[PDB]
């Protein structure tokens, strides 16, 4: 089985050992980790994951009717039996702990293991802690690691200081398994790492304004799921965003319930290409400084039910290709200069049959609209004014897949 797999799927299956038992992992987590570890493409890595689900070595469940577009896999669960993870563990205890490659470590009520005084040679390290953890951090050396996963259950948490010793880190993930969000602190240590490129957080209480303060000069992407932002401050203009964040390209904000106002600093990342604010149900409007993202390509706002309108300065986004507003129930009318965007090719607007198309949408060419049929009534009148229109219609199939996230 494990041996019967080809070489590449051997380590792809071995990476599953680092996640806690019966954990419902979204498919974007391990895909981002794999992209940084193995330098491959996201699409082919999703193909590897489909392959592993075809040999009945993992379970893959879609959560809704989103397609496999360019690396938007925040909507697929990977779920694995106990014994399959146990088998994935079985192949990796053969070598010794200080010179393991894949090492999974446990810490129960500050009973630190007594071999961590040594020099660990892992390149993929995971750390798990329980409810009583008090953040009394032992001092270790871990210079061979490139990935890092921290499972939490605590009401309050401090990142270890020896993180500054991993000069080879590439990926970072923190997942909180507690009932109430964890309060992260001691986070500026990351500013010493010259190779950090992707960071992901989940269910953690963060004052979002930190990132410009922290000089993440090499960060490529940042994703937040179910995060809490606390008191939304803005008045720190002391630090140039475009100089601290020279390499930021993607920001994915998902399910952030308390975010009523988008932060000030993200409008100053001129290296932005993607921006994704999905399932954020307190966001009512967007800043008019968003037109300052002159190189924005993609823009997703899927399933944000309270957003009443799109800002005018959307005129200024001269690079927009893809534009996704599926299931935006509160959306009433597109901006009245939407037709000045001479690169917009696609749009998905399922369940947006209540949204009034402005005139200048006829000034577009070769566009493909995806929508339901009640939306097409808006898109069928204007057909003879558009020389290369396509309006492709699928249907909403119904299933109970989201009852897994209960």
């Amino acid at each position: 089985s494990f041996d019967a797999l080809d070489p590449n799927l051997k380590e792809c299956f071995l990476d599953m050992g680092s996640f806690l038992e019966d954990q419902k992992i979204r498919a974007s987590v391990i895909i981002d980790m794999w992209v940084e570890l193995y330098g491959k493409g996201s699409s082919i890595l999703y193909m590897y994951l489909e392959d592993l689900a075809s040999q009945n070595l993992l379970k893959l469940v879609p959560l809704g009717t989103n397609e496999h577009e360019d690396g938007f896999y925040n909507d697929f669960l990977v779920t694995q039996h106990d014994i399959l993870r146990e088998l994935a563990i079985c192949q990796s205890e053969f070598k010794e702990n200080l010179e393991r490659k894949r090492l999974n470590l446990e810490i129960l009520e500050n009973t630190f293991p007594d071999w961590c005084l040594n020099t660990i040679n892992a390149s993929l390290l995971s750390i798990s802690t329980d409810d009583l953890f008090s953040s009394k951090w032992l001092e270790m050396d871990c210079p061979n690691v490139e990935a890092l996963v921290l499972n939490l259950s605590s009401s309050d948490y401090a990142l270890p200081s020896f993180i500054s010793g991993m000069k080879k880190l590439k990926v970072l993930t923190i997942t909180n398994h507690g009932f109430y969000p964890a309060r992260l602190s001691n986070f500026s240590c990351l500013s010493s790492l010259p190779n950090l490129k992707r960071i992901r957080l989940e269910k953690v209480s963060i004052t979002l304004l930190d990132i410009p303060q922290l000089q993440l000069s090499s960060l490529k992407k940042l994703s937040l799921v179910m995060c809490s932002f606390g008191e939304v401050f803005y008045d720190t203009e002391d630090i140039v965003v475009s100089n601290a964040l020279s390499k930021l390209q993607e920001i994915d904000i998902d399910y952030c319930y308390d975010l009523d106002e988008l932060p000030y600093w993200i409008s100053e990342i001129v290296s932005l290409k993607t921006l994704s604010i999905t399932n954020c149900n307190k966001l009512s409007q967007l800043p008019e400084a968003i037109g300052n993202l002159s190189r924005l390509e993609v823009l997703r706002l899927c399933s944000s039910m309270n957003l009443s309108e799109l800002p005018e300065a959307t005129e200024g986004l001269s690079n927009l290709r893809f534009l996704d507003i599926s299931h935006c129930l509160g959306l009433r009318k597109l901006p009245q200069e939407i037709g000045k965007l001479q690169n917009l090719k696609k749009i998905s607007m399922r369940k947006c049959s209540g949204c009034e198309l402005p005139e200048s949408v006829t000034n577009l060419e070769n566009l493909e609209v995806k929508c339901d049929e009640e939306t097409g009534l808006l898109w069928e009148r204007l057909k003879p004014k558009m020389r290369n229109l396509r309006v492709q219609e699928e249907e909403i199939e119904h299933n109970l897949n989201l009852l897994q996230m209960f």
Binding site: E395, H398, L400
Partner: protein, 580 residues
């Protein structure tokens, strides 16, 4: 052209007119044979008791037909029967009875494989139509062959039926057997559009003037003008009412008025052939005929207002010149041809009247396009996948659990049940939209008789009604609104049941089997002896016809088996099904 349209040619018109002239002498009717043709002509009348029956209390003389003697003259899914004039029905019933030797003659003429034609001048015309329908209910509907096709050919008859009469002829495809000749100003095709009270004091004189037999009576300018004026005023209001509710346009103030208005229930039926001294115009559309019955006899210009009242009477007697000289006139079928402006101004219609007639024809076209859209929807593949997933996936897996898909749905422990529920709701929506289009008269008359529709609706009802009953009883909805068969059952299922039963026949339904067993169980056996006996009596017929499946209802986990087993062994020893 005319012959390819109506199915008759000139010599048949000639013979019918001659025979209906002969019938002015004989008593109640007159038979005539010519080779392979036999024609029965009927005698007219020119009194008042033979238009408005003195016994009848209503304001137009109307009576409702009988469901055992004219079973097809009804709205199938709804239930409503048609309405006719009581005087004409009485005349027909006097003629039909055995003392007259009329049935024996028609049976003689039908076993000989000849063509049968009914005809008559004005009042006789109204009887001819009724006889045709009687024939169609007794002979043609039991073995429909071209030998048995009848003809009805009437000359200036008055109106006979309501809107359900015309609809019932249309649904059966019988509207092509009837032909009615109306001259432009002839006044008798318009009499029965008036209130009885508005003409009761001046009716007999003008009737006396219409009789071609007792011609010795003399005119009166004022009586003639008064009859004509009041008749056309009631005609005016009937036509305007018809336009205002063509599409249900702002029905509110119209209803508020309706509390103040009394309007005739009589509508044209069959094909109507208007005639002038230049042209013959044929119409099959009843709404257009109703508008042209008012706009053709309005004044071409002003000073003609003194000629019309008398020329109406004189034109009632102009069907001999018409019949001998009809090959010399131009023929045009109004429904098809599109240059109606020249035609309709030739008939004398104004521009308002022409727009109203155009509106009527357009609404017929809209009904046809509605039917096209519905056929397109029900022919697609997502619809039939919804219907085939229940047949081939849900039902077999529920048969393999050994309890059946009724009880499987009623427990509802899996995502397969969630999927069945959502599919059930989707099909419910589609059949409800079709039913709503039928209830507003937005579909053509023959939709309920289409055979593709009957097959589809029967398959749907027999698959899915058990699941609607399982939904009703699963969630205790029968303690909030009562038993299912009374206030719970949807109207789509009743309509489907009625349409199928009509199509074939020319604890009452098998698809409602489960409802009965839900009402009957949990009760002491003394009170439910009779109802359990009727159910177990009809189970064999249901299982054969295919209404009820036999692999489902006898399963071990099923609800019906677990009720049947608890009955007394005294009953279980003599049951018609004890070997299951």
């Amino acid at each position: 052209a005319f012959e390819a349209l109506t199915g008759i040619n000139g010599d048949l018109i000639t013979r019918s007119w001659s025979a209906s002239k002969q019938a002015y002498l004989t008593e109640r009717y007159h038979k005539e044979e010519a080779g392979a043709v036999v024609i029965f002509a009927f005698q007219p009348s020119f009194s008042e008791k033979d238009f408005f029956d003195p016994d009848n209390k209503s304001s137009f003389g109307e009576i409702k037909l009988n469901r055992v003697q004219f079973p097809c003259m009804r709205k199938i899914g709804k239930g409503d029967v048609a309405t006719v004039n009581e005087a004409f029905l009485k005349n027909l019933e006097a003629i039909i009875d055995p003392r007259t030797s009329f049935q024996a003659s028609v049976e003689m003429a039908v076993r000989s494989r000849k063509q049968i034609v009914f005809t008559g001048h004005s009042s006789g015309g109204a009887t001819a139509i009724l006889a045709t329908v009687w024939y169609l209910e007794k002979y043609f509907i039991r073995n429909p062959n071209v030998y048995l096709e009848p003809r009805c050919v009437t000359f200036g008859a008055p109106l006979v039926g309501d809107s359900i009469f015309s609809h019932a002829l249309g649904r059966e495809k019988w509207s092509r057997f009837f032909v009615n000749f109306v001259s432009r100003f002839d006044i008798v095709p318009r009499i029965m559009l008036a209130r009885k009270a508005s003409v009761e004091e001046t009716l007999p004189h003008v009737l006396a003037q219409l009789d071609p037999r007792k011609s010795s009576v003399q005119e009166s300018e004022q009586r003639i003008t008064e009859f004509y004026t009041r008749v056309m005023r009631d005609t005016s209001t009937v036509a305007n009412q018809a336009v205002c509710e063509l599409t249900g346009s702002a029905e509110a103030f119209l209803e508020t008025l309706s509390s103040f208005l009394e309007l005739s229930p009589y509508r044209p039926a069959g094909t109507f052939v208007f005639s002038t001294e230049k042209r013959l115009v044929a119409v099959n559309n009843s709404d257009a005929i109703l508008q042209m019955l008012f706009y053709t006899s309005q004044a071409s210009d002003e000073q003609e207002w003194s000629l019309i009242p008398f020329r109406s009477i004189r034109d009632h007697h102009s069907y001999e010149e018409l019949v001998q000289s009809m090959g010399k006139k131009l023929f045009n079928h109004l429904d098809g041809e599109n240059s109606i402006e020249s035609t309709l101004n030739d008939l004398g219609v104004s521009t308002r009247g022409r727009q109203y007639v155009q509106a009527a024809l357009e609404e017929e076209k809209k009904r046809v396009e509605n039917q096209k859209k519905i056929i397109q929807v029900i022919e697609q593949e997502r619809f039939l996948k919804k219907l085939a997933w229940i047949e081939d996936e849900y039902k077999p897996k529920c048969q393999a659990h050994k309890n059946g898909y009724y009880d499987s749905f009623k427990v509802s422990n899996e995502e397969n049940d969630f999927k069945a529920n959502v599919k059930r709701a989707e099909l419910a929506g589609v059949f409800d939209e079709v039913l709503g289009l039928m209830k507003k008269c937005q579909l053509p008359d023959e939709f309920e008789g289409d055979i593709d529709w009957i097959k589809l609706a029967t398959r749907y009802r027999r698959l899915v009604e058990p699941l609607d009953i399982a939904n009703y009883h699963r969630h205790l909805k029968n303690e909030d609104t009562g038993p299912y068969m009374k206030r719970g059952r949807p109207t789509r299922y009743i309509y489907a049941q009625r349409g199928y039963e009509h199509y074939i026949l020319k604890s009452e339904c098998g698809s409602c089997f489960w409802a009965e067993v839900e009402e009957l169980k949990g009760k002491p056996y003394e009170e439910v002896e009779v109802r359990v006996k009727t159910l177990e009596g009809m189970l064999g017929e249901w299982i054969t016809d295919g209404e009820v499946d036999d692999k489902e209802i006898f399963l071990e986990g099923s609800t019906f088996r677990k009720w049947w087993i608890t009955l007394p062994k005294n009953h279980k020893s003599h049951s018609p099904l004890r070997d299951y």
